[PDB]
JSON list of C-alpha atoms in Angstrom, two decimals:
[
{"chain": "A", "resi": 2, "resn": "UNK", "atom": "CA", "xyz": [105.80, 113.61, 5.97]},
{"chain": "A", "resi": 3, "resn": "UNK", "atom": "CA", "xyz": [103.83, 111.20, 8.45]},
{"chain": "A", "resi": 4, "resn": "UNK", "atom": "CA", "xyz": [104.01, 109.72, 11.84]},
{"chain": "A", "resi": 5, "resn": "UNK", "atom": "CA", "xyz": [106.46, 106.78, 12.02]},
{"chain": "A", "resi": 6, "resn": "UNK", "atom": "CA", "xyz": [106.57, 103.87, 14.24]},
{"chain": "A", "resi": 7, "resn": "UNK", "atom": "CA", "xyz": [110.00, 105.19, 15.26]},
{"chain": "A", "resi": 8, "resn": "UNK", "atom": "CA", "xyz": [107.91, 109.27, 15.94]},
{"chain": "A", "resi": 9, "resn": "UNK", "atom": "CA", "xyz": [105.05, 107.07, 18.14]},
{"chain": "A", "resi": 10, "resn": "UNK", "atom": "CA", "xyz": [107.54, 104.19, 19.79]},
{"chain": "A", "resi": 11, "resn": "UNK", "atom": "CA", "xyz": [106.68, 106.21, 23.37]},
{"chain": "A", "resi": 12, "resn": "UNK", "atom": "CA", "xyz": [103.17, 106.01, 22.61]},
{"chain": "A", "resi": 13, "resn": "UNK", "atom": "CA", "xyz": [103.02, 102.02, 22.28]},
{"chain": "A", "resi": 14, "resn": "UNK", "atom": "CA", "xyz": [101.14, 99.99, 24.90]},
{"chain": "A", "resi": 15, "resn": "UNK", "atom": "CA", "xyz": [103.12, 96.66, 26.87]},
{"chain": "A", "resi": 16, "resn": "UNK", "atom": "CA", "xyz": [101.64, 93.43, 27.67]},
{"chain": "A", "resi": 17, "resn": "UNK", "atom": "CA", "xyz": [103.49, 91.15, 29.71]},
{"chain": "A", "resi": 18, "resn": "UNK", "atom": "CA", "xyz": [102.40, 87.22, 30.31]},
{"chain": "A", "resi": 19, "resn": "UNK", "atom": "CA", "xyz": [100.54, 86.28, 33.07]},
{"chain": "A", "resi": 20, "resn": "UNK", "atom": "CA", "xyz": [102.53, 83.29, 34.44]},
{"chain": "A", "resi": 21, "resn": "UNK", "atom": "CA", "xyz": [106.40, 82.12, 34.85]},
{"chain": "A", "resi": 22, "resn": "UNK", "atom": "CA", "xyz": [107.87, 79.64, 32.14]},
{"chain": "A", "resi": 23, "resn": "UNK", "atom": "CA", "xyz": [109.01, 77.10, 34.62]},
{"chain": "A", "resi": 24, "resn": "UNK", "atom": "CA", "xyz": [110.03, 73.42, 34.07]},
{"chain": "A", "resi": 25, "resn": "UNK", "atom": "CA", "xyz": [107.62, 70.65, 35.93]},
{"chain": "A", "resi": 26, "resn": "UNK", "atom": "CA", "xyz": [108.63, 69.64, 39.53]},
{"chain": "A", "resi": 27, "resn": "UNK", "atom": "CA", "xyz": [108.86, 66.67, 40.98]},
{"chain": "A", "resi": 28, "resn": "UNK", "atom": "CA", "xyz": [109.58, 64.78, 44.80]},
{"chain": "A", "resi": 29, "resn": "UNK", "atom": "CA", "xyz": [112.28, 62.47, 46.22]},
{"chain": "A", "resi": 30, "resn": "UNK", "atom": "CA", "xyz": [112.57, 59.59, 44.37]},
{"chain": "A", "resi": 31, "resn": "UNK", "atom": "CA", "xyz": [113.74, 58.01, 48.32]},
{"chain": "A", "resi": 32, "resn": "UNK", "atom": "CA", "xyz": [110.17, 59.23, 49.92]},
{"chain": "A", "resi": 33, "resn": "UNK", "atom": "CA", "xyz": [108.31, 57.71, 46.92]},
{"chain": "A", "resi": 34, "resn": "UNK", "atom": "CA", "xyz": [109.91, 54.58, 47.17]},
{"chain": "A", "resi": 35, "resn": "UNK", "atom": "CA", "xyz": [110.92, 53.54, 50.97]},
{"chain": "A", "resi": 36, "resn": "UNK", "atom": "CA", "xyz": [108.68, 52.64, 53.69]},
{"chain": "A", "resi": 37, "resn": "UNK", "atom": "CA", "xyz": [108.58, 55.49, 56.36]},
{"chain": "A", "resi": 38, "resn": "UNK", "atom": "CA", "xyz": [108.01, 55.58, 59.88]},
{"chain": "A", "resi": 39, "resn": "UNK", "atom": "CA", "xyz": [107.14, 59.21, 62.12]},
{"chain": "A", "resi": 40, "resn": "UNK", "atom": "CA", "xyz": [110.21, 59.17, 64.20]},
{"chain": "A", "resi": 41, "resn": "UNK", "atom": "CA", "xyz": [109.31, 60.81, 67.87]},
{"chain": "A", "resi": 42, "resn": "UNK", "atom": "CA", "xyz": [112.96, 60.93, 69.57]},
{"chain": "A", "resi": 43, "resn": "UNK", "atom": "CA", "xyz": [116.07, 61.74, 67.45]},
{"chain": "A", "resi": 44, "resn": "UNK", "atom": "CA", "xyz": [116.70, 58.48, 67.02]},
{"chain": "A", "resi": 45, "resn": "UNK", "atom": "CA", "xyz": [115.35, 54.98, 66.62]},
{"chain": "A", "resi": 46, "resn": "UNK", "atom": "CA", "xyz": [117.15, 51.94, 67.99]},
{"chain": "A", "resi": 47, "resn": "UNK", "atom": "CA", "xyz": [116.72, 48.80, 65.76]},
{"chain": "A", "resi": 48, "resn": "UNK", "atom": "CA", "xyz": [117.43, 45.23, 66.49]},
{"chain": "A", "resi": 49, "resn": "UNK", "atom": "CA", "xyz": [118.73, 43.13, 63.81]},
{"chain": "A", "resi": 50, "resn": "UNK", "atom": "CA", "xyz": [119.59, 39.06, 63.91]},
{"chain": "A", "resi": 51, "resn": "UNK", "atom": "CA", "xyz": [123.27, 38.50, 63.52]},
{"chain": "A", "resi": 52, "resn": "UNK", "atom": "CA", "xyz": [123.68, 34.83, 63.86]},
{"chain": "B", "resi": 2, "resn": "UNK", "atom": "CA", "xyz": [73.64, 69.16, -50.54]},
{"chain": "B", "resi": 3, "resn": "UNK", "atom": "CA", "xyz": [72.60, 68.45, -46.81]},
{"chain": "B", "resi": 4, "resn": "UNK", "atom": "CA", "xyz": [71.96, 70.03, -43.22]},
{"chain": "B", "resi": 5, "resn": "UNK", "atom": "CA", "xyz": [75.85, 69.83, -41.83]},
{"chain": "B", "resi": 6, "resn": "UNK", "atom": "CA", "xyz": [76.29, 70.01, -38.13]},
{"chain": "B", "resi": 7, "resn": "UNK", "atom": "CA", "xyz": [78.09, 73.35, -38.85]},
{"chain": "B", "resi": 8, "resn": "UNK", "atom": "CA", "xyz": [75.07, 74.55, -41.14]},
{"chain": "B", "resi": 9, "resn": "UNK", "atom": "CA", "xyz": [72.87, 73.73, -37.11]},
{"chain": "B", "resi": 10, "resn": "UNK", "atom": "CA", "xyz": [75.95, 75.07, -35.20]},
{"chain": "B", "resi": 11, "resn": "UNK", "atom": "CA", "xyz": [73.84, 77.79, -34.32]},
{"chain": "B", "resi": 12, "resn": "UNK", "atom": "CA", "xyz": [71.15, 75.89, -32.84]},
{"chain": "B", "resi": 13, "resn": "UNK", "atom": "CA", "xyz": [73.18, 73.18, -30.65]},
{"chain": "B", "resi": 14, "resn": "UNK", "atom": "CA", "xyz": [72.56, 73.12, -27.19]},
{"chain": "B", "resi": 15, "resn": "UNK", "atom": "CA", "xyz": [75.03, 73.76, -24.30]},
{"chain": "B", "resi": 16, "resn": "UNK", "atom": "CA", "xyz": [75.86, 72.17, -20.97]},
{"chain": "B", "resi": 17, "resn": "UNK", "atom": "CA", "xyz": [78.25, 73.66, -18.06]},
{"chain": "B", "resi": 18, "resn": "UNK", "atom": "CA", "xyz": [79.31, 71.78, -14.63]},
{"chain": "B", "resi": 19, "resn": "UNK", "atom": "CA", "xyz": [78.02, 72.89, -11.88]},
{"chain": "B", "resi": 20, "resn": "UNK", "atom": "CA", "xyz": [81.07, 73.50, -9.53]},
{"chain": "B", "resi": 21, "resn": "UNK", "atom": "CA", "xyz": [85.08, 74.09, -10.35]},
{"chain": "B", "resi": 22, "resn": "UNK", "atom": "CA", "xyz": [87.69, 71.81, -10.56]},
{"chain": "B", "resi": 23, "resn": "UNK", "atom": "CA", "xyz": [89.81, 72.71, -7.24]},
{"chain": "B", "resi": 24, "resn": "UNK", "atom": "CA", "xyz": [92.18, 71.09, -4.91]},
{"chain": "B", "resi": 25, "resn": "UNK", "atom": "CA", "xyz": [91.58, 70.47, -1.46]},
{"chain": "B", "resi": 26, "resn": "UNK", "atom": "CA", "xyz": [92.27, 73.57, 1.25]},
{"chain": "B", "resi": 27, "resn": "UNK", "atom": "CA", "xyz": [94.63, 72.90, 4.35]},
{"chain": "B", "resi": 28, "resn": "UNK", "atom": "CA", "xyz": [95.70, 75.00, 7.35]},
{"chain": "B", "resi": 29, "resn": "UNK", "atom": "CA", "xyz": [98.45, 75.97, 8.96]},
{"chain": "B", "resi": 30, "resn": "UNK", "atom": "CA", "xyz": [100.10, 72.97, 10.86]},
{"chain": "B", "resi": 31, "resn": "UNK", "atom": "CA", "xyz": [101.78, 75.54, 13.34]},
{"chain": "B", "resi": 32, "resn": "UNK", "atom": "CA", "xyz": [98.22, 77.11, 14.03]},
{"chain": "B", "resi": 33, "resn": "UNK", "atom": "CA", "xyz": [96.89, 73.14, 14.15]},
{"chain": "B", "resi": 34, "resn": "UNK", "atom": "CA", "xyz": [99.68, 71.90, 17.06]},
{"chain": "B", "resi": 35, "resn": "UNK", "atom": "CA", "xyz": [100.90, 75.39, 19.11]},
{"chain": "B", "resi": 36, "resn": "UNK", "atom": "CA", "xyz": [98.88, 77.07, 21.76]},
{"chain": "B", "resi": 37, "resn": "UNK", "atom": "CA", "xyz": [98.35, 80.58, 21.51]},
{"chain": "B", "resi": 38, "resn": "UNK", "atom": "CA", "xyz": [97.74, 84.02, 23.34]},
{"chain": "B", "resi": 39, "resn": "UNK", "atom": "CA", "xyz": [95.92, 86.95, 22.17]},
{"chain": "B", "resi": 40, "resn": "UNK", "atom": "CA", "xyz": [98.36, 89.65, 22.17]},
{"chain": "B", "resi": 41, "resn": "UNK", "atom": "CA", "xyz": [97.24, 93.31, 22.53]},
{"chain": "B", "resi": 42, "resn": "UNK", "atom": "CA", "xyz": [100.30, 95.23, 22.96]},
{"chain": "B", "resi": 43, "resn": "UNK", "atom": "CA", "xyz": [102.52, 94.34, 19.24]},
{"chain": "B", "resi": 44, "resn": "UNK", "atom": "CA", "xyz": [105.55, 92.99, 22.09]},
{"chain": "B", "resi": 45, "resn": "UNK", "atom": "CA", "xyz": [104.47, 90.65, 24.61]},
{"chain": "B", "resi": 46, "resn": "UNK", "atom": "CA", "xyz": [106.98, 90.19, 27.61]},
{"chain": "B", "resi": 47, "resn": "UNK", "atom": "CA", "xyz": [107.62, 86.48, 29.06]},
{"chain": "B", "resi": 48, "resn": "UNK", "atom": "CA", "xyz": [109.69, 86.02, 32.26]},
{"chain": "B", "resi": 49, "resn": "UNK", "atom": "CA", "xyz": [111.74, 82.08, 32.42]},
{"chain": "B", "resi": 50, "resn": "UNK", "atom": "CA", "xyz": [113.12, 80.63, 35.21]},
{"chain": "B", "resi": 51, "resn": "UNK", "atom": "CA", "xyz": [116.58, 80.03, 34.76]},
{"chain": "B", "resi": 52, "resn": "UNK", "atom": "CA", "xyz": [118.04, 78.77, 38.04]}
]
């Protein structure tokens, strides 16, 4: 007879990591790209050359 | 009759190399590439984001 792992499984210590497994992240390809302006009102009016 | 090199055999000299004949040692390649953790526990626990 002797004391196996099965007889001391309640005994046994945990670890758990420290951090989440995550993929990388990464921003709007549109905001990285395209000029921005800070828009005060809602909306911005825009003239454009027709003819 | 005559002095024979097995009638000296007795008296010959002797020589020995100073090191053995041995391949090269390598390590592991997984303990070369993979990062590792020191575990303390015999089951570590690792949480994944999965949505």
């Amino acid at each position: 007879a002797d004391i196996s792992r099965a007889d001391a499984l309640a005994l046994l210590a945990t670890q758990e990591l420290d951090s989440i497994i995550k993929p990388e992240t990464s921003g709007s390809a549109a905001l990285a790209a395209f000029r921005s302006i800070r828009m005060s009102a809602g909306t911005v009016s825009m003239p454009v050359l027709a003819a």
